[PDB]
Design a protein around this ligand. Structure first.
Ligand SMILES: CCCCCCCCCCCCCCCCCC(=O)OC[C@H](COP(=O)([O-])OCC[N+](C)(C)C)OC(=O)CCCCCCCCCCCCCCCCC
Ligand SMILES: CCCCCCCCCCCCCCCCCC(=O)OC[C@H](COP(=O)([O-])OCC[N+](C)(C)C)OC(=O)CCCCCCCCCCCCCCCCC
Ligand SMILES: CCCCCCCCCCCCCCCCCC(=O)OC[C@H](COP(=O)(O)OCCN)OC(=O)CCCCCCCCCCCCCCCCC
Ligand SMILES: CCCCCCCCCCCCCCCCCC(=O)OC[C@H](COP(=O)(O)OCCN)OC(=O)CCCCCCCCCCCCCCCCC
Ligand SMILES: CCCCCCCCCCCCCCCCCC(=O)OC[C@H](COP(=O)(O)OCCN)OC(=O)CCCCCCCCCCCCCCCCC
Ligand SMILES: CCCCCCCCCCCCCCCCCC(=O)OC[C@H](COP(=O)(O)OCCN)OC(=O)CCCCCCCCCCCCCCCCC
Ligand SMILES: CCCCCCCCCCCCCCCCCC(=O)OC[C@H](COP(=O)(O)OCCN)OC(=O)CCCCCCCCCCCCCCCCC
Ligand SMILES: CCCCCCCCCCCCCCCCCC(=O)OC[C@H](COP(=O)(O)OCCN)OC(=O)CCCCCCCCCCCCCCCCC
Ligand SMILES: CCCCCCCCCCCCCCCCCC(=O)OC[C@H](COP(=O)(O)OCCN)OC(=O)CCCCCCCCCCCCCCCCC
Ligand SMILES: CCCCCCCCCCCCCCCCCC(=O)OC[C@H](COP(=O)(O)OCCN)OC(=O)CCCCCCCCCCCCCCCCC
Lengths: 140, 175, 347, 49, 98, 115, 120, 54
């Protein structure tokens, strides 16, 4: 999963929308596959068809969220000519939250997911700009 | 193809491990573990450790016999599954054998494989030593040095076995 | 159980942990782990009820799997190094397998599933012995192999354990499950700071042992197993309610109590290495532990829950239990902050 | 006599009291002696007499 | 490395994935535990005999001893189970879910 | 080389004595001869029912004792070491611990059969 | 950290270098606080067993504060030794590597330039 | 006018096995007070042997 994030992050922002969208789709599909694997492990479905339906549903939902987030972020970065600006990532996070609300068929989940994932994506872009470290190599 | 004798014995070893790890029924699991112990003692006897192979063969035969008595006594079913009475057991046995033979075919083609470590494809006869060992076998002197050197190991092992006996007495009491 | 056999078994548990602590050979480490598991199994089988049998079976299966992984990693390290010195390893796969085995032995998430069930199915004495003493040897083994653990793996395990314990502690009414989830959260807290400075890890281990022992001994003295009897304790002895109130306020990381001792200084070791997001997230997650501690204090001491008529007879009989070292342990768990540099003896 | 039954702590345990007092006195004199020898040897090492 | 090392490690992984997915029977899991112990023994003695480390020949046999120090123990953790319930299924061990 | 030849020879000689015993004579199979034998009457229940054992404790004791005496098997070769007092002391200690475990099993009524 | 420092002579509470340091006074404030901890422990021990907390068992409270003072004094000695070791090792490493710790000039405020941000 | 102290309604919330029930946690009975379960004695199935005429 190290190569997927590096593949998504080395593409310049606002240059190629399709490759960035494909990379975000792959990241979302991987996360959804992990989530669905844990779900069918701990909570056993009643049948094989129900299990593969749940796995496909989770993977498709996460892939749609990632694809729409990447497409919206790249579209905002191209439209505003501001590649190093976290507001495009905030817009993409809110678009992903609206996608999650559409997949869950509810509005409050969509609004809350918009707000929280927009803040999270803005923070991720902020950390990429400022060189923040989450798993810091010990030095002292 | 007699130079790959240890490789063939190891293939039968993983075959028996696939056979009893699919868990059909503990009788046939015990039979598979007996076969695996036999070919494993053959492997280590081919490497020169005849005493260790004979000892592990005897110990695992006794353990598997006590196990078989237990499953006849306690872990039994009206219709035990041999290997094909259950779809999941037969399926996982088939894929285990298929994966093993796929690895064999891949390592027998370019004489190299990468599964998480890196492995060669030549027979293990290359890694032997060329010199003699005098008038003693190294493994026999090594295990005989348990009493002259390993006093601490003997003490902690004897205490562990005595405590284990006491533990077996205390667990199966009921009150 | 015969008292002679009980003394012999407890001495065997102590000898196994000592053997793990003082040996310079990997085979001796595994031998001590096996002896500790074998001598700790029948302690949980003390009362001979079915729940002890389920708890013992689950604990035995998990510990056997962990010991198998530990021996496999030891054999791989022998293959790649040709020695037996308990030091840094020379294969990343062996380091990963040892970290997974020690995480299963410590009950750290996502290997945390057996901890609340085993803790609930066994008496309070075996539960205290497990959750305090059995978490000493794997921490020592993790202390020894410090230049070998992958940073990402151990940090992911720590944050996962902290989040999962904080989330799981909310939905419990049994006291033993609450203590188990608290132990998982504290496990994540200790393993979060291990790679930076293990002196803080030892300080956190000592503090956590003291507070867990205090809470378990108070549970012995009040003879409580659920939240309702702990609430009912106000009629029998209010001093016990005061002690559990100040102890649960200590374990919530609230100054000026000694539970603010590890966590604060843990933050003091993560900002020197330029990690500011992780201690903030860890404190925000420990707020959940503080939350269910506050719920326990509200149920127990700060509100006067209704009692029954029969407690009147319990007013005529004082406690005659052997509350060993309880006032000293409470004083250590509550008022140890102004002696903060004492931890310099742990270097 | 007030209680209908003899309390287990009706009379002071004289051996326990004597052991406690002896232990406290021994610990106090040992700590004082240790402090005196420590400060004397510290003055000897640095020559700060 | 060599070839027999790869085969013994593959056998260990096969027995590991046999152990980690239970099939509603405790004896099968105990057999898997014995198989992993046997694989570890064989790998250890293969490496030791290859590298001529004679003084470590005390290691595997002593190691084999501690096999029973859980394995027989597992049987003692079964009979009470088989006294609690008529069978030894692992789905009957779900009383500690509340 | 010779051991597998002997094994294969004995296996072939054993496995040839059943295919001779099978394909040679005149066979007559009906659905009354091959029933399980229970002294002329059909059995009650199956033979796969749980057969409640009594000597489980002695079985676990044998499980420990087989390898705990297999530790004592290199004692001939251990007589060839230069250090002899330590070897003698350790061997006597091992068999003494064996005797202590056996006596503890005997005194606690562990060798007796249940029910 | 200092584990290698505790490698040649391990399992020593106070080594031979700890005796060249001045011992803590018997009127140390930390020692008085540990004695107060012992007094609090004695009070709690009297309280949890339904005894009069200020009268029952004066010998028990005396032994409590005496043992607390003893252990606290030895722990304070070890803490002072460890901090002296830390300072000595730091100064020795600073002296040993002068190129890694070069001196910097001390420019006066008549030469250095600071930007002024008005508040208005 | 008196200080409010909890009644059986406030005290009965913590009397369950779980704090927030769900659909999965519907049959979760609380554990027994002494943690000792009834033995649930099944049929022991003594084997019936035919010590027959032959
Ligand atoms: C009461 C409700 C509202 C509470 C609001 C509280 C404040 C909101 C913001 C808090 C951020 C977290 C603390 C930041 C401290 C930064 C110190 C510092 O040196 O920063 C520079 C450092 C700089 O990194 P550095 O110093 O390691 O690197 C060297 C410097 N550079 C970058 C030049 C190389 O900043 C950071 O490390 C990142 C700071 C942002 C952290 C984002 C994660 C936390 C997000 C907020 C969570 C708040 C709690 C939410 C839940 C509340 C309960 C429900
Ligand atoms: C180690 C000691 C043992 C060594 C090996 C055995 C030594 C003896 C080998 C020869 C034994 C005799 C032949 C096999 C047994 C025949 C038994 C019998 O009654 O068969 C009747 C049957 C004949 O019966 P039928 O075919 O008429 O059938 C009557 C039954 N109904 C009609 C209901 C189906 O014989 C055979 O089937 C053939 C036997 C072999 C004939 C000769 C073959 C060539 C020999 C050279
Ligand atoms: C009501 C509840 C209780 C109270 C809660 C707290 C309320 C007060 C705090 C939030 C107020 C709104 C957000 C702050 C607005 C003012 C500052 C700001 O972010 O301006 C927008 C900024 C303008 O750009 P500029 O300032 O040049 O950015 C480079 C400087 N770093 O624009 C940008 O830089 C582009 C967008 C960046 C990402 C913004 C969103 C994430 C960060 C803020 C959260
Ligand atoms: C837009 C919209 O339709 O919102 C309604 C939605 C609930 O949708 P529904 O009730 O199904 O119609 O409602 C929601 O989705 C929930 C509210 C949406 C976000 C509201 C943000 C502002 C809230 C007040 C902030 C004050 C400070
Ligand atoms: C509330 C929660 C706030 C979280 C704030 C996180 C801020 C971002 C931290 C991670 C990050 O993006 O770091 C920047 C880094 C790119 O910089 P660099 O280290 O040079 O990457 C090359 C790889 N060596 O990026 C990388 O190294 C790769 C990208 C890492 C992204 C981590 C987060 C992924 C999304 C959440 C899971
Ligand atoms: C499905 C059910 C099973 C169906 C098949 C049944 C087959 C027969 C099963 C019974 C026989 C099992 C034999 C197991 C291994 C026995 C090893 C043995 O006998 O070793 C004796 C001897 C050791 O002496 P040593 O000290 O090494 O002397 C060398 C110095 N002159 O050794 C020597 O002197 C070395 C001679 C050559 C050894 C070659 C390597 C070992 C060959 C093993 C063959 C396969 C065994 C399979 C066992 C399966 C058991 C179920
Ligand atoms: C990668 C990890 C998985 C490796 C094996 C993958 C193929 C075989 C398994 C396919 C999935 C079936 C499965 O494992 O089902 C779980 C089963 C227990 O389920 P059961 O109670 O038998 O039936 C209810 C529903 N099956 O439990 C089992 O079937 C357990 C038996 C597993 C045997 C694994 C060893 C064979 C070799 C694997 C490769 C190494
Ligand atoms: C960096 C590495 C540092 C390592 C430090 C190691 C320090 C020493 C070891 C500490 C570990 C815990 C030791 C005690 C384990 C638990 C013992 C236990 O549970 O004993 C049971 C006993 C039962 O008493 P009773 O009430 O009569 O019986 C009821 C019927 N079953 O009694 C009880 O239930 C009551 C409790 C008895 C023990 C309380 C005191 C010891 C444990 C807390 C530590 C106190 C402070 C001293 C050590 C500081 C550092 C940890
Ligand atoms: C220090 C010497 C060496 C010691 C270590 C080495 C020992 C080697 C032999 C190992 C023996 C292992 C088994 C021992 C079991 C003893 C306990 C026991 O079972 O006693 C029972 C028995 C009475 O029989 P009962 O109770 O009916 O038994 C039930 C079914 N028969 O009780 C008895 O019959 C009484 C048994 C105890 C008294 C025996 C006295 C023997 C005297 C021999 C001559 C003097 C020897 C001097 C050396 C010191 C002896 C203590
Ligand atoms: C009251 C305490 C009494 C202590 C008596 C002496 C015990 C002893 O020998 O301690 C030695 C130990 C320092 O030994 P060292 O080799 O540095 O240990 C490295 C640990 N990672 O010293 C220490 O660990 C001192 C701190 C012990 C604290 C124990 C209670 C908390």
């Amino acid at each position: 999963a190290k190569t997927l994030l590096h593949q998504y992050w080395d593409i310049p922002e606002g240059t190629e929308c399709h490759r960035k969208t494909y990379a975000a789709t792959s990241i979302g599909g991987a996360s959804g596959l992990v989530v669905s694997a844990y779900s069918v492990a701990l909570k056993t479905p009643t049948s094989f068809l129900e299990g593969v339906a749940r796995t496909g549903r989770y993977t498709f939902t996460a892939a749609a969220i990632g694809a729409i987030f990447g497409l919206t972020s790249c579209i905002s970065a191209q439209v505003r000519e501001k590649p190093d600006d976290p507001l495009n990532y905030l817009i993409g996070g809110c678009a992903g939250g609206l996608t999650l609300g559409a997949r869950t068929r509810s509005y409050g989940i969509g609004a809350a997911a918009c707000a929280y994932m927009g803040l999270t994506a803005a923070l991720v872009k902020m950390g990429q700009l400022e060189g923040w470290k989450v798993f810091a190599e010990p030095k002292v | 193809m007699m130079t790959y004798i240890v490789f063939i014995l190891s293939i039968i070893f993983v075959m028996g491990f696939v056979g009893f790890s699919s868990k059909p029924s503990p009788i046939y699991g015990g039979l598979g573990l007996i076969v695996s112990g036999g070919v494993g003692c053959g492997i280590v006897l081919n490497f020169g450790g005849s005493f260790l192979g004979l000892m592990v063969f005897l110990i695992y035969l006794g353990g598997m016999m006590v196990v078989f008595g237990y499953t006849t006594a306690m872990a039994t079913e009206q219709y035990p599954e041999v290997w094909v009475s259950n779809k999941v057991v037969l399926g996982t046995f088939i894929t285990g054998l298929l994966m093993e033979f796929l690895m064999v075919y891949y390592v027998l083609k370019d004489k190299e494989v990468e599964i998480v470590f890196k492995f060669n494809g030549m027979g293990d006869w290359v890694i032997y030593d060329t010199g003699d060992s005098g008038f003693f076998s190294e493994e026999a002197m090594g295990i005989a040095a348990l009493y002259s050197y390993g006093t601490w190991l003997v003490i902690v092992t004897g205490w562990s076995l005595l405590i284990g006996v006491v533990v077996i007495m205390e667990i199966t009491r009921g009150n | 159980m015969n008292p002679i056999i009980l003394i012999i078994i407890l001495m065997t548990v102590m000898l196994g942990t000592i053997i793990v602590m003082i040996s310079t050979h990997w085979l001796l480490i595994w031998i001590g782990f096996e002896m500790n598991m074998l001598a700790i199994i029948p302690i949980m089988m003390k009362k001979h009820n079915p729940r002890a049998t389920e708890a013992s079976t689950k604990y035995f299966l998990t510990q056997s799997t962990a010991s198998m992984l530990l021996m496999m990693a030891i054999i791989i390290n022998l293959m790649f190094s040709g020695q037996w010195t308990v030091m840094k390893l020379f294969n990343p796969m062996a380091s990963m397998l040892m970290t997974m085995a020690l995480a299963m032995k410590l009950g750290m998430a996502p290997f945390h599933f057996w901890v609340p069930e085993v803790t609930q199915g066994i008496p309070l004495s075996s539960g205290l012995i497990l959750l305090t003493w059995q978490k000493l040897a794997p921490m020592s083994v993790l202390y020894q192999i410090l230049p070998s653990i992958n940073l990402d793996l151990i940090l992911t395990l720590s944050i996962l354990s902290i989040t999962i314990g904080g989330w799981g502690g909310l939905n419990q009414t049994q006291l033993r499950k609450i203590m188990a989830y608290s132990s998982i959260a504290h496990m994540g807290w200790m393993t979060a700071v291990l790679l930076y400075n293990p002196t803080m890890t030892l300080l956190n281990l000592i503090i956590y042992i003291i507070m867990t022992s205090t809470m378990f001994t108070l549970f012995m003295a009040n003879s409580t197993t659920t939240t309702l009897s702990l609430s009912h304790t106000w009629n029998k002895a209010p001093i016990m309610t005061i002690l559990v109130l100040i102890t649960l306020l200590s374990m919530g990381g609230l100054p000026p109590l000694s539970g603010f001792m590890p966590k604060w200084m843990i933050i003091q070791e993560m900002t020197k290495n330029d990690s500011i997001i992780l201690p903030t997230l860890m404190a925000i997650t420990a707020l959940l532990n503080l939350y269910f501690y506050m719920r326990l204090t509200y149920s127990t001491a700060l509100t006067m829950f209704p009692s029954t008529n029969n407690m009147k007879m319990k007013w005529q009989f004082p406690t005659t239990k052997r509350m060993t070292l309880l006032p000293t342990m409470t004083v250590l768990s509550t008022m140890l902050l102004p002696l903060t540099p004492i931890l310099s003896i742990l270097e | 006599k007030f209680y209908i039954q003899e309390p287990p702590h009706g009379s002071p345990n004289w051996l326990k009291v004597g052991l406690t007092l002896g232990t406290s006195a021994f610990l106090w004199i040992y700590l004082i002696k240790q402090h005196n020898e420590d400060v004397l040897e510290y003055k000897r090492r640095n020559g700060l007499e | 490395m060599s070839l027999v090392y790869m085969n013994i490690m593959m056998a260990f992984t096969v027995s590991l994935t046999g152990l980690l997915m239970y099939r509603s029977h405790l004896m099968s899991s105990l057999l898997c535990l014995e198989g992993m112990m046997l694989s570890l023994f064989i790998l250890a003695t293969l490496m030791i005999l290859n590298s001529h480390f004679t003084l470590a020949s005390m290691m595997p046999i002593i190691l084999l001893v501690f096999a029973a120090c859980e394995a027989a123990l597992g049987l003692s953790l079964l009979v009470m189970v088989s006294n609690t319930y008529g069978t030894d299924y692992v789905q009957n061990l779900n009383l500690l879910q509340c | 080389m010779n051991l597998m030849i002997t094994l294969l020879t004995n296996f072939t000689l054993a496995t040839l004595l059943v295919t001779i015993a099978f394909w040679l004579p005149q066979l007559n199979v009906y659905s009354e001869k091959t029933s399980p034998y229970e002294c002329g009457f059909d059995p009650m229940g199956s033979a796969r029912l749980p057969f409640s054992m009594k000597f489980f404790l002695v079985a676990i004791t044998f499980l420990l004792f087989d390898l705990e005496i297999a530790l004592l098997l290199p004692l001939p070769w251990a007589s060839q070491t230069t250090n002899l007092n330590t070897m003698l002391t350790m061997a006597l200690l091992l068999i003494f611990l064996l005797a202590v475990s056996l006596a503890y099993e005997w005194t606690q009524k562990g060798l007796e059969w249940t029910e | 950290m200092m584990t290698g420092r505790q490698a040649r002579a391990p399992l020593q509470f106070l080594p031979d270098e700890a005796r060249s340091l001045p011992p803590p006074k018997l009127t140390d404030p930390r020692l008085a606080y540990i004695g107060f901890l012992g007094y609090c422990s004695g009070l709690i021990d009297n309280a949890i067993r339904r005894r009069p907390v200020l009268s029952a068992g004066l010998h028990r409270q005396f032994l409590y504060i005496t043992s607390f003072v003893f252990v606290g004094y030895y722990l304070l000695k070890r803490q002072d030794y460890m901090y002296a070791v830390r300072d000595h090792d730091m100064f020795s490493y600073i002296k040993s590597h002068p190129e890694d710790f070069p001196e910097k000039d001390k420019k006066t405020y008549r030469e250095v330039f600071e930007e002024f941000h008005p508040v208005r | 006018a008196r200080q409010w102290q909890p009644d059986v309604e406030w005290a009965e919330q913590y009397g369950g096995a779980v704090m927030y029930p769900t659909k999965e946690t519907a049959h979760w009975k609380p554990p027994p007070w002494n943690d000792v379960d009834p033995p649930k004695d099944t049929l022991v199935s003594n084997l019936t042997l035919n010590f027959g005429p032959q």
